[PDB]
Amino acid sequence: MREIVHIQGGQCGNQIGAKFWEVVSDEHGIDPTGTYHGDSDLQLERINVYFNEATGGRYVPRAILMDLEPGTMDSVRSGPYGQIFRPDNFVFGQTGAGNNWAKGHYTEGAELIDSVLDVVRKEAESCDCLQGFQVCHSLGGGTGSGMGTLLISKIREEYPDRMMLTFSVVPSPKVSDTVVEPYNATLSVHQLVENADECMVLDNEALYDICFRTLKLTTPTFGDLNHLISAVMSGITCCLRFPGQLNADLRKLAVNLIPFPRLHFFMVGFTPLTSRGSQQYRALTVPELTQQMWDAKNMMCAADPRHGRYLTASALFRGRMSTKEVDEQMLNVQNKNSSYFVEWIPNNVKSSVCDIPPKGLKMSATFIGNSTAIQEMFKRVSEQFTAMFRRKAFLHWYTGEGMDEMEFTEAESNMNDLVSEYQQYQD
Amino acid sequence: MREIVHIQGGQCGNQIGAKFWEVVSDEHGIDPTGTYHGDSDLQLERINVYFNEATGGRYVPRAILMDLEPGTMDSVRSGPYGQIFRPDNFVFGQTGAGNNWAKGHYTEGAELIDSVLDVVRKEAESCDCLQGFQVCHSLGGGTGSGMGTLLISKIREEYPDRMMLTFSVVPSPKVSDTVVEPYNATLSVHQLVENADECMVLDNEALYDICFRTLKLTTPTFGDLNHLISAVMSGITCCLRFPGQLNADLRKLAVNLIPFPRLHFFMVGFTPLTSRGSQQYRALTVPELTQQMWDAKNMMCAADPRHGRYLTASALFRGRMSTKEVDEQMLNVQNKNSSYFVEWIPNNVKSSVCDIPPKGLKMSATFIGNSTAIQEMFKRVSEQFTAMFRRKAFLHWYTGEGMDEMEFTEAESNMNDLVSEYQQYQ
Amino acid sequence: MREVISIHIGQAGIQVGNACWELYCLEHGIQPDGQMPDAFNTFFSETGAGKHVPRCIFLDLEPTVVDEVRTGTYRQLFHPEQLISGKEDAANNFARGHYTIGKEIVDLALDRIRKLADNCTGLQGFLVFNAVGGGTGSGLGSLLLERLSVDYGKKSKLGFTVYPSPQVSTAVVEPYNSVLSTHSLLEHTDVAVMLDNEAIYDICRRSLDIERPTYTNLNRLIAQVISSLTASLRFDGALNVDITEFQTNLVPYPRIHFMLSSYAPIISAEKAYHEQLSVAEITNAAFEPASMMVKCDPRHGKYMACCLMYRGDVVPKDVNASVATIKTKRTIQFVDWCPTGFKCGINYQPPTVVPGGDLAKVQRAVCMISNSTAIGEIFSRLDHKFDLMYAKRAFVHWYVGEGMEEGEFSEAREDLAALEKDFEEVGAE
Amino acid sequence: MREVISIHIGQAGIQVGNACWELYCLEHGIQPDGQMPDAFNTFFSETGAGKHVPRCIFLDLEPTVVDEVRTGTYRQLFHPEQLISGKEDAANNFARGHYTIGKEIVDLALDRIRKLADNCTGLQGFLVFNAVGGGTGSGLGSLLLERLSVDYGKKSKLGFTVYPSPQVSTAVVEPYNSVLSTHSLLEHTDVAVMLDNEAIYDICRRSLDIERPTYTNLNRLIAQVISSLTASLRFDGALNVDITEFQTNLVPYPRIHFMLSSYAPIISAEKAYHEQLSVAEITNAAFEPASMMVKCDPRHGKYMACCLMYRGDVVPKDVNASVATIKTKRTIQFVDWCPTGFKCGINYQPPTVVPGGDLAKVQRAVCMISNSTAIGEIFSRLDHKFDLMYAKRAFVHWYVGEGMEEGEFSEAREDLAALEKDFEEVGAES
Amino acid sequence: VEGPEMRRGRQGLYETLQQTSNPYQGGNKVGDAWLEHKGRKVQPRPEP
Ligand SMILES: Nc1nc2c(ncn2[C@@H]2O[C@H](COP(=O)(O)OP(=O)(O)OP(=O)(O)O)[C@@H](O)[C@H]2O)c(=O)[nH]1
Numbered sequence A: 001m002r003e004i005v006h007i008q009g010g011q012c013g014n015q016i017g018a019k020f021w022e023v024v025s026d027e028h029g030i031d032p033t034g035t036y037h038g039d040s041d042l043q044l045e046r047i048n049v050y051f052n053e054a055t056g057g058r059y060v061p062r063a064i065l066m067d068l069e070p071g072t073m074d075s076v077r078s079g080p081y082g083q084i085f086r087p088d089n090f091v092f093g094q095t096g097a098g099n100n101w102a103k104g105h106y107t108e109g110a111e112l113i114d115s116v117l118d119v120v121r122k123e124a125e126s127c128d129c130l131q132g133f134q135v136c137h138s139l140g141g142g143t144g145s146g147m148g149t150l151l152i153s154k155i156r157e158e159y160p161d162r163m164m165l166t167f168s169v170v171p172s173p174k175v176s177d178t179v180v181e182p183y184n185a186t187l188s189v190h191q192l193v194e195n196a197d198e199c200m201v202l203d204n205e206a207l208y209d210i211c212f213r214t215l216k217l218t219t220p221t222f223g224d225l226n227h228l229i230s231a232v233m234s235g236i237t238c239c240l241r242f243p244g245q246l247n248a249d250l251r252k253l254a255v256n257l258i259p260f261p262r263l264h265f266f267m268v269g270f271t272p273l274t275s276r277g278s279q280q281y282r283a284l285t286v287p288e289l290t291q292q293m294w295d296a297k298n299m300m301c302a303a304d305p306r307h308g309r310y311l312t313a314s315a316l317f318r319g320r321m322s323t324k325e326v327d328e329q330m331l332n333v334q335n336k337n338s339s340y341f342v343e344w345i346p347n348n349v350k351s352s353v354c355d356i357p358p359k360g361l362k363m364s365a366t367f368i369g370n371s372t373a374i375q376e377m378f379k380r381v382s383e384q385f386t387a388m389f390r391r392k393a394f395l396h397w398y399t400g401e402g403m404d405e406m407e408f409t410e411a412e413s414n415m416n417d418l419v420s421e422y423q424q425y426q427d
Numbered sequence B: 001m002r003e004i005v006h007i008q009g010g011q012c013g014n015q016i017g018a019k020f021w022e023v024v025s026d027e028h029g030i031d032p033t034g035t036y037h038g039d040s041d042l043q044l045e046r047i048n049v050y051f052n053e054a055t056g057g058r059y060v061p062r063a064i065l066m067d068l069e070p071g072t073m074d075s076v077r078s079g080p081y082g083q084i085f086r087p088d089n090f091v092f093g094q095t096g097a098g099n100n101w102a103k104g105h106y107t108e109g110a111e112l113i114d115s116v117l118d119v120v121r122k123e124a125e126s127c128d129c130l131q132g133f134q135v136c137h138s139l140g141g142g143t144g145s146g147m148g149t150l151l152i153s154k155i156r157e158e159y160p161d162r163m164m165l166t167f168s169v170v171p172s173p174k175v176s177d178t179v180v181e182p183y184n185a186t187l188s189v190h191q192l193v194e195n196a197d198e199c200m201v202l203d204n205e206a207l208y209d210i211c212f213r214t215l216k217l218t219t220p221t222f223g224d225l226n227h228l229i230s231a232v233m234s235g236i237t238c239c240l241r242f243p244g245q246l247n248a249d250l251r252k253l254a255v256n257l258i259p260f261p262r263l264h265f266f267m268v269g270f271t272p273l274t275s276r277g278s279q280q281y282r283a284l285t286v287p288e289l290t291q292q293m294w295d296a297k298n299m300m301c302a303a304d305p306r307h308g309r310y311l312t313a314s315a316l317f318r319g320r321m322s323t324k325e326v327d328e329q330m331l332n333v334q335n336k337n338s339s340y341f342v343e344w345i346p347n348n349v350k351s352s353v354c355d356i357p358p359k360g361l362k363m364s365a366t367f368i369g370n371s372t373a374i375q376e377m378f379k380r381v382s383e384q385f386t387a388m389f390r391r392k393a394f395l396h397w398y399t400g401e402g403m404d405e406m407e408f409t410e411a412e413s414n415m416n417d418l419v420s421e422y423q424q425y426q
Numbered sequence C: 001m002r003e004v005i006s007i008h009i010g011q012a013g014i015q016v017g018n019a020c021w022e023l024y025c026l027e028h029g030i031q032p033d034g035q036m037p038d039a040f041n042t043f044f045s046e047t048g049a050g051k052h053v054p055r056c057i058f059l060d061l062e063p064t065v066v067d068e069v070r071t072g073t074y075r076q077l078f079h080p081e082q083l084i085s086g087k088e089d090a091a092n093n094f095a096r097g098h099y100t101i102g103k104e105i106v107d108l109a110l111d112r113i114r115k116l117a118d119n120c121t122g123l124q125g126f127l128v129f130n131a132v133g134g135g136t137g138s139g140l141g142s143l144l145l146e147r148l149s150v151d152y153g154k155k156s157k158l159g160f161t162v163y164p165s166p167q168v169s170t171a172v173v174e175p176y177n178s179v180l181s182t183h184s185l186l187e188h189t190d191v192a193v194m195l196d197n198e199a200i201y202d203i204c205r206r207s208l209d210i211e212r213p214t215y216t217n218l219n220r221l222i223a224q225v226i227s228s229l230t231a232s233l234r235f236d237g238a239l240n241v242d243i244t245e246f247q248t249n250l251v252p253y254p255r256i257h258f259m260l261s262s263y264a265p266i267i268s269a270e271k272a273y274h275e276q277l278s279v280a281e282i283t284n285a286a287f288e289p290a291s292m293m294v295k296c297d298p299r300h301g302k303y304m305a306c307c308l309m310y311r312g313d314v315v316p317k318d319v320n321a322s323v324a325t326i327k328t329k330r331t332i333q334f335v336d337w338c339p340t341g342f343k344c345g346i347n348y349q350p351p352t353v354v355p356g357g358d359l360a361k362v363q364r365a366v367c368m369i370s371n372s373t374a375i376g377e378i379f380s381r382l383d384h385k386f387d388l389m390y391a392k393r394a395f396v397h398w399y400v401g402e403g404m405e406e407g408e409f410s411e412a413r414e415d416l417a418a419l420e421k422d423f424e425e426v427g428a429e
Numbered sequence D: 001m002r003e004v005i006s007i008h009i010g011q012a013g014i015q016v017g018n019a020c021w022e023l024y025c026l027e028h029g030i031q032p033d034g035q036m037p038d039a040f041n042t043f044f045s046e047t048g049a050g051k052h053v054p055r056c057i058f059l060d061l062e063p064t065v066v067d068e069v070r071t072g073t074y075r076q077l078f079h080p081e082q083l084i085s086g087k088e089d090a091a092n093n094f095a096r097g098h099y100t101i102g103k104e105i106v107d108l109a110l111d112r113i114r115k116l117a118d119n120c121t122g123l124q125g126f127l128v129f130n131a132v133g134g135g136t137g138s139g140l141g142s143l144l145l146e147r148l149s150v151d152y153g154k155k156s157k158l159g160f161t162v163y164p165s166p167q168v169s170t171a172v173v174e175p176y177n178s179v180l181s182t183h184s185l186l187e188h189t190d191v192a193v194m195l196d197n198e199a200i201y202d203i204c205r206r207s208l209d210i211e212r213p214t215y216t217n218l219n220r221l222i223a224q225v226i227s228s229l230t231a232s233l234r235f236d237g238a239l240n241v242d243i244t245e246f247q248t249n250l251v252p253y254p255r256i257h258f259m260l261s262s263y264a265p266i267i268s269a270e271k272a273y274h275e276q277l278s279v280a281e282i283t284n285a286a287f288e289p290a291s292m293m294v295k296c297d298p299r300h301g302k303y304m305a306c307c308l309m310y311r312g313d314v315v316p317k318d319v320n321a322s323v324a325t326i327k328t329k330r331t332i333q334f335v336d337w338c339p340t341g342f343k344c345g346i347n348y349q350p351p352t353v354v355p356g357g358d359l360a361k362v363q364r365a366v367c368m369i370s371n372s373t374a375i376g377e378i379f380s381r382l383d384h385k386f387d388l389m390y391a392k393r394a395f396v397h398w399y400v401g402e403g404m405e406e407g408e409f410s411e412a413r414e415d416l417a418a419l420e421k422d423f424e425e426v427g428a429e430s
Numbered sequence E: 001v002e003g004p005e006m007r008r009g010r011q012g013l014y015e016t017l018q019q020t021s022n023p024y025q026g027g028n029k030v031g032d033a034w035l036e037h038k039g040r041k042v043q044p045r046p047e048p
């Protein structure tokens, strides 16, 4: 009886959160129409985590999709698995922030955030026990950043005893998708530090080389990029909706991976990534899982884990596994290279086993890493924000809507605070 | 055997009761030709409440159509289910009030009230145990506003212990339909205070708000608003025509909704109005009906219920419904919103269930709420009259027909008297 | 039964009525000979075996305009002796149509009103059609409306009067005729609808893009407005407005009963293809000042009462949204004691289209009739024209010799002086 | 539902408006009769049953160019009332278009815009097209631009202006009109995307390899740029952009809002088969100076803010791969304070091909619309041309007669000194 | 004379009040604003 509310914000949120609802609907076994068509009875055991019972056995997701531009919901409803969402949850705008954090947070959000907390509240007390909220939005954009983080701030005021996941995508290191990315990234981080209980970072170039070098596909599209984004989020909640030998609920993923309340940003990695042309040569054994799970190339963040140690690690194993080999592999990697782990926490790695694997695959894992190497993702954005702000560049668009540079000075002050404290605990 | 005599007044009344009998007769399974085509014996179990058996199985309503112009006579005769009415109930005029409340009450209403009062006397004597009389009219016009309220005073003297259900539409605040609405409404409300047992306030702009936002209709026509009124008119008499696990007829509601004799105006609404897009995805249960019951957007009155305290409230649930689940959610809404319910009446909300739902629906509920928020409509209607009366404009039509200006002066005085009585209890 | 009798006086009455019953027979399917190949009873009385005759009289002192109807294509429609002629013209003389030659012709008129009133079961009102600048319209209309007031008490009498324009007056003694007509119409007529021939000229030039309009094209537009006001009788609707509904809801005071006129969609055939004509767009065109059918500017005045007659496939959901959007506009002003300034009437039939007419097929139409304080502009202006002429007694010797002595000029001057004082105080805040 | 109302002033705008609305009907499939045999809804309003009229006004003081549209192939397409004419043209005089003739036509012009505003539910912005060298293009637009800003607050405006080339121009007082028009478009126009008349002549001669082109041929590839930037508003994409998205993304400072333009694939039909048209080839051709719509050498300047409008079968990685390759090239130089310099707008529709046009059917296309510091080279040469003109007050007596005063020449000159000095200091390293 | 929606096509509020029929897997698509939201074009392709 643990219910998870899914929140999507903006162009990136409504598009890649659709594919998260693609894989869960494909794994729990519900059709695009909305009825159950699974093989086993294990799927129907915990449907209430993500879906609501309705008339005729239809299961409507506990998802509110919200943005300022009407173009996304044209794409959301038209795509496959798009009919399942309730239209009352399809709250939208008419203007569109247009990659601006100020319009989403203050000017054009203010007439709409009051509407979205009416929709969230209707699905709040509809269910029995709120475990918390999960959100997947963008930081380089503005319709999911400013409009999103205001929602993230507002729900913590209303519901302070519940937990937050922010599957926020950051600007890529070598390439940039938007010019004003460093402004909207740092202003979103300043709000996500004190409001979000934990954060998981995804990076597109970290997905790009994975989909090419490891998955051996010549031209993955964005749908191929969002699939591993969709695959990792289903590995977050694998122990909730399904039984297992050792269960790790989403509060366990918070209380275990986070030593200090400010040090909550993570990195994620999906373990069994083999191509179609290389799968049959590979033997599906848990030594082959653990070597790929701890690889630097497999992580979906811009950081390289050889630069900085892991403060706390996790692993969300799915399937029928021998837990002795699972335990001794994590013991071996803790004993093979003790330099790459933080020394002052003994036995840094957590493992929990879900007894049922995902569809098709029989053995999988989901790495959660609170590594101190991700300060490089903070620092590279932080040096971009300082350089852009010192000439007051692109600022009359922001300060014209109700902003002053006091928050921008404050946003940097928490931005460089993170890289300072992340480096401090590494030493 | 607890029968109800229907009176339909004017342009608004004849059109409202045209669709009202168009729905209730379909609920009871009556075809256009007045015969029977149903399948369950419960439908024919209580038909004396609304219909009269005729020779050959014909079912005629106890509806008396009363108006001052013969335009609406063809409007209801040529409509769908328009031939079920007896022709002796088509008492009509020829000149028309012309939105003149004095003309419907004094000059030309005198030669038509003595005709409609014969027909009501004919229908009331033919039936055994009168539960009460139902009237439907408007407050912004002249035919149902003037001659309708004159019928109320005459019918209250003849039957003082019977119950009057006054169905009225009120002039909308934001949009105006006739210029003489302050003169018509403030006069018509005043005789509704001493004569009507209870009144059920409707409002057009609240009905437009419901269709556009809740039902999400791209085009709400003039009859779609009428259809939502009939869905709640049929809900008040749910327990009369049908069995129930907890019965609540007209008089059981009136004694539980009227704490003081002058506070007999109600705001009402219908719960299970879901849009066609959101039709599949709604899990129809008792929590859904309650969370739509006390939503301020679902009300059919111009007054926001959050502004004034609820004095008393009534719920008439319909369907095979759990009696505990009704009761444990009446307590939920009272405790979660403590400031909106008046303190010195404990246990404001009164609930009842009828075991059979409307056709095609499985769970449904209708609402009656006696709130002190309705003074916002009452104050606004009165202040439009005071701004009108101090200039004495649009009054030479009224004062040329047999009203000195002093009779208007008791109209706002009584209008200010109720807004004084609603003020002290909030 | 809903039954109204329309009378047509003066030259302007006959030509407007000719274009009126042209549209009325086409609306109800009546062929010009009168043979139909239930709702016709508002204006046509069924005669004998399947023939309908108009409920009108075409009375005039010019025999040239009356027998033009007799020699025209409508020789079989109208009754022969309901088209009342005259031997000698009034010839722009208010005193001639009142005392000299108006006396011998009003007795034949009252006989035909009585014969038409006994034919109709329940009379609903009287429609009059005149131009107050002419001798017959002002003179005989003063005498005719006097007699119907005594004979037919407390009965509605709708007035569609045409007034001289500010810029143009096609006759010289029109300030004398218009002022002396307003002395009689003030006490007797119940609702007067002001029309100006030169504001309709501006409507035809711009909206219908006709550079060369004439009197017939003007009268086509007038006939559409009169049909729209009375379409509530002939056809049903969500909100239908009787002519008895009309007077009591728009006349606040006994001596203020003059009305403005507006018809919102005036679009020719070429422009009708591209214009998206919906309710919210046309309600802005109705209150647009260039579409007003008189040359008084409503921005200077304040709207006192306003009636909206909506024709065509008009849903009632947006007319409430359309009226409220007008009230939010700052340019449209209302008097302080009337917060409730609207009367909306919805009719389900679209307006008909005449073959060869300038107006095109339109799905939804709006007819707006309003009462405004800007009517003092058209009355103080014609006061200035009459006062300037009366400074040295211009054209008075024609009026004095025909019975009407010199006191009536001073008496009518004082009546309109009280009328000018009446509009300035009703607009006072 | 979102809509955009294009505005065209001046006969340069009308010929572009003839070319740009030709493609919009062709791409959405609208026949010249105006019938369909919601994609149209961002440009065409539905009227009645199966009919589309353009959300645009063609206001111009010259009647010969306006009625040519009234007698062309699109007689029943445009609303005849939306096409506004004038009795006499301004004739390369900013005074005639702003004070004397302009005042009696902007009252009718704003009335049509107000009628256009109520028809659309959510108006996204206005696209203004004018020639700064013309009389009515400078004069009537400037009176129109200030009236739109005071009427519709903060609504986006896109200045798709035609500037004369410093090497080639076709009138003697184009330096006067361009200077005076620039005084009005700084305070009002949100984004001023530049276009050069002579620069696109070089594109037709070299890349499109047609040796005898005319203005109908030159307006088409300009019109292909206009559709590519707005097709994201028109059509779905992986990373969609909007009209409102563009201003806050490419304008860092409130008085630097000038954009250079480049369209990548310019090859003929016979060249189309032999070219290996590819994502790396088109992006490398985009930064090539001869592909610019404005006569600029961006090596002299620096790229401050850029924007990529991708259309067609473009996978996400190579457009990101083309981002990295340009940043490694020392030939293309960016200013040191804007590291995030690229906006990638990808549209899934390949561009349409015009029947009889010189452009060929291609699958992938790039529309580069980039701010740069090389724009000051245009304004320095225009100011140098203006200095010689005003040194002896030649061609001034025409302006002072028709309402304008002598002091307005100095104030408009004073702004271009402030504009030119702002371009240098922003591009200056610090 | 018939009203507006009798010639538009949607007649009465029976279907949307009594909740009979269904917009999806059915025929009636003429009433609800969510149903006449048209939306942008569709270029479908399965994930690789
Ligand atoms: N609405 C309308 N007005 C007209 C028409 N023809 C003439 N008028 C007006 O009528 C005025 C002329 O006065 P009339 O009342 O027609 O003159 P008359 O009716 O012949 O009266 P006498 O000449 O005295 O017999 C002119 O100033 C016009 O403004 C018409 O066809 N329609």
Ligand SMILES: Nc1nc2c(ncn2[C@@H]2O[C@H](COP(=O)(O)OP(=O)(O)OP(=O)(O)O)[C@@H](O)[C@H]2O)c(=O)[nH]1
Residues within 6 Å of the ligand: D009, D010, D011, D012, D013, D015, D016, D061, D062, D089, D090, D091, D092, D093, D130, D131, D132, D133, D134, D135, D136, D137, D138, D162, D169, D170, D171, D197, D215, D216, D218, D219, D222
């Ligand atoms: N690219 C392009 N430029 C054009 C086109 N037509 C005209 N021009 C340019 O516009 C300049 C003339 O300015 P315009 O604004 O068109 O002159 P105008 O509109 O007639 O102004 P008035 O004389 O006042 O009526 C010429 O020098 C051309 O360079 C065209 O079709 N395409």
Ligand SMILES: Nc1nc2c(ncn2[C@@H]2O[C@H](COP(=O)(O)OP(=O)(O)O)[C@@H](O)[C@H]2O)c(=O)[nH]1
Residues within 6 Å of the ligand: A009, A010, A011, A012, A013, A015, A016, A098, A099, A138, A139, A140, A141, A142, A143, A144, A145, A169, A170, A171, A172, A177, A178, A204, A222, A225, A226, A229, D238, D239
């Ligand atoms: N994986 C993935 N990332 C996306 C997608 N669309 C946008 N993004 C990321 O989001 C950022 C731009 O998002 P944007 O559209 O501006 O967000 P919004 O406009 O505020 O809703 C870029 O840095 C991208 O990395 C997508 O379809 N898939």
Ligand SMILES: Nc1nc2c(ncn2[C@@H]2O[C@H](COP(=O)(O)OP(=O)(O)O)[C@@H](O)[C@H]2O)c(=O)[nH]1
Residues within 6 Å of the ligand: B009, B010, B011, B012, B013, B015, B016, B099, B138, B139, B140, B141, B142, B143, B144, B145, B169, B170, B171, B172, B177, B178, B204, B207, B222, B225, B226, B229
């Ligand atoms: N709900 C509803 N309201 C109506 C109906 N008919 C009229 N009204 C309202 O009644 C008011 C005017 O009533 P009116 O037509 O003058 O009634 P009359 O006196 O009989 O002519 C307006 O505000 C209308 O909104 C109807 O059929 N249903």
Ligand SMILES: [Mg+2]
Residues within 6 Å of the ligand: D010, D011, D060, D061, D062, D065, D089, D136
């Ligand atoms: Mg020109």
